[PDB]
Write a protein that binds this ligand. Structure first.
Ligand code: GDP
Ligand code: GDP
Lengths: 407, 404
């Protein structure tokens, strides 16, 4: 029963979409009503031109906002020097080899993974919204390899069936980035598809020490952002588990190094909470465990070194902590503004209804005679009352969404 | 048989030559001194001639006991985790160095061959022998040794009967990863070596950090021979789709580095200076064979046999190299110093044989004068002649062990 914390975001996205669809209806049901009280000739000064323009203009806005919402997702970007393991991590999070990840696999560019509803994967390049079909991680690798023309820094969106890993179902986009030791100007290309990530992951190789280039990059990032969500995965941990003599000291030296980094060098986090961003893991091992667990075979011969379970736990710990983290942050970052933008539309749509109801009441009160005419004044006054009562119900739904998902 | 024995052969050949040198020169200085101090001869042998035999006397022991300590040193460099300690160990057939002590500490580490049955540790500054039996006790004691500070090198002594290389007078040296303050530190503490090996991590591209080091070494050095070990090659072979390429590119830059950048070899000999291996596979294959077990569970990736074939071919070529180079670098000057000394000693004798003749010939007084002068001519002649026999077999050494 994996209640993956990403579902908090799937839930919120569902809720704010439901409210916005009701709202599109409410303003179109409303525009149809303001279009009719305006066109009526036996009804003057009741519906103003400054109210008909907004009631059609909101109808336009809300359609486009619905489009923007239906696209929002969670975006996590990975970074680190070449062959640290970035592609091995991602594939392990997806329980299969989605991205290529050998030695010498093309690394010159960004590769994102994200889900499609079909059973056929596919691919997209820059400048072309053609969907280039992609049949397997093998032919994806052999294709990239042959592209000598493939631009440096460019973006390649992979679309992988949501029914292969859960992570892709639950609206999460994962982004692999050019090796941070062979590019020099990666801090320039990050503005295209990575500066707006919710969570960044430094995939540090734990057979080494954190080189300045990796740290220098996150600097230039953290300079432009506001307390970004930075995780460090000292990957390849198994390497040092083959020699227990030094395991305590080796870890304590990395763990002190990463701790001092986030806490003191990046100042993005304090020590107490840093302990839930630095993990020691083995992507190659996690991916081997999973890619076998799905096929049916039991947990046999996956551990290349002793300590495999301790390591797997720490990874599952990372996935847990990270998932929770990205969904809380992204729900706020990507929805709190549309929520505020609806409270304003509602607040003015309904006071348009109040001014329509209020005029029609004062028309029947001081300027009305005909049985046929005053019977229109009552159906306009009742409809405006009914629609304004819809607005208040939507205002409550939004108060409720904000209460559940937006403290 | 091991191509190493050529160094051993020379060592014994020359070291006993220099014995006779200390023998000959002592007898000849005993005779110069007497003829000089003799008050009945005058200027048959000079004060200039006296002091020269005395210096030659006191210097020849020094050069002979320094001489006997000479050996072949091989140095390994490369950034942390590339496989240095692993390469060394594959060449000794055992895990004598531990891996994560280069990761905890930065120190040099040597393995010389002891004639004892149990290994032992020695640091700098002390003459305490910490004895070890298992590698684990070594790996532990290295860890606990608080004195293991930067640049401080520990000699590990490993029984000569446990590996031919240490038996055959070879010393191997690990070193801190070039990932630091090792710029001006290396000097004679590792630039004394005859061959430098560069252990490169195939997972990356050859980085400046390594080149930046060997280029700095190459400036204060002339024509040093260097091998590049592209280690961890199993990681490339696991991914065949990119493997031809990754190997081509590593060849290309390795080739360029030696031939063009470093100007240390030519394009045809560079071929036998670059290798694509997997140290850990070799250490496994050999630590398992050491106990007579068949080979099993050793391959890290398909092609293990080729990586093994390449490490064996590398070892042959390495031993051929450091056997020929080390005889020349460690001995030839001492040969030149020796043939210098003989030519100078044999002219000294002649100079008194002729002073003796020119007395016996142009100033004989009594039979007793004549008797004393003739003794000295035969004495000079007999010494003068043992110099020419030493000159001959000392040349006979060069023709056999310094061909040009
Ligand atoms: N032992 C071990 N090897 C790993 C681990 N993670 C990655 N690798 C290996 O590291 C090499 C580079 O990994 P890769 O996925 O390409 O990292 P990237 O180049 O930055 O994308 C590959 O040969 C993997 O097999 C790990 O946790 N343990
Ligand atoms: N897969 C693989 N691993 C290796 C190879 N050579 C060394 N290693 C591993 O690299 C890690 C660190 O290498 P090490 O031998 O300590 O090199 P050093 O740190 O520079 O002395 C060790 O855990 C080795 O097991 C190889 O050829 N293949």
């Amino acid at each position: 029963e994996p209640v993956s914390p990403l579902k908090h975001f799937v839930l919120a996205k569902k809720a704010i979409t439901a409210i916005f669809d009701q709202l599109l209806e409410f303003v179109t049901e409303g525009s149809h009503f303001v279009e009719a009280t305006y066109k009526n000739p036996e009804l003057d000064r009741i519906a103003t031109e400054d109210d008909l323009v907004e009631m059609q203009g909101y109808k336009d806005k809300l359609s486009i906002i619905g489009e923007v919402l239906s696209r929002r997702h969670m975006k996590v970007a990975f970074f680190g020097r070449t062959s640290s393991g970035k592609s091995s991590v991602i594939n392990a999070m997806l329980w299969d080899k989605v991205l290529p990840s050998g030695i010498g696999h093309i690394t010159n560019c960004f590769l994102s993974v994200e889900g499609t509803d079909g059973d056929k994967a596919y691919l997209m390049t820059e400048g072309s919204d053609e969907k280039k079909s992609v049949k397997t991680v093998n032919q994806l690798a052999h294709a990239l390899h042959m592209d000598k023309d493939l631009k440096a820094g460019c973006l390649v969106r992979v679309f992988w069936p949501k029914a292969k890993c859960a992570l892709l179902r639950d609206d999460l986009v994962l982004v692999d980035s050019p090796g941070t030791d062979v590019t020099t100007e990666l801090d320039s290309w990050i503005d295209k598809f990575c500066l707006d990530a919710d969570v960044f992951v430094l995939v540090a190789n734990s057979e080494s020490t954190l080189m300045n280039t990796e740290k220098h990059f996150f600097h230039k990032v953290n300079e432009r952002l506001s307390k970004p969500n930075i995780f460090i995965l000292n990957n390849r941990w198994d390497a040092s588990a083959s020699e227990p003599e030094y395991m305590e000291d080796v870890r304590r030296q990395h763990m002190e190094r990463c701790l001092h980094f986030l806490v003191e060098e990046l100042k993005v986090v304090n020590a107490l909470e840093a302990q839930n961003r630095i993990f020691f893991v083995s992507a190659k091992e996690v991916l081997s465990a999973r890619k076998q667990k799905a096929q049916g075979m039991p947990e046999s011969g996956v551990a290349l070194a002793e300590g495999f379970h301790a390591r797997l736990q720490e990874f599952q710990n990372f996935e847990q902590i990270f998932e929770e983290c990205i969904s809380q942050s992204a729900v706020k970052t990507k929805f709190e503004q549309h929520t505020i933008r609806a409270k304003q539309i509602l607040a003015t749509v309904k006071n348009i209804m109040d001014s329509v109801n209020l005029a029609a009441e004062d028309k029947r009160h001081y300027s009305a005679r005909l049985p046929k005419e005053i019977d229109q004044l009552e159906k306009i006054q009742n409809n405006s009352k009914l629609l304004r009562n819809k607005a208040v119900q939507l205002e409550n739904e939004l108060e409720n969404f904000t209460k559940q998902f937006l403290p």
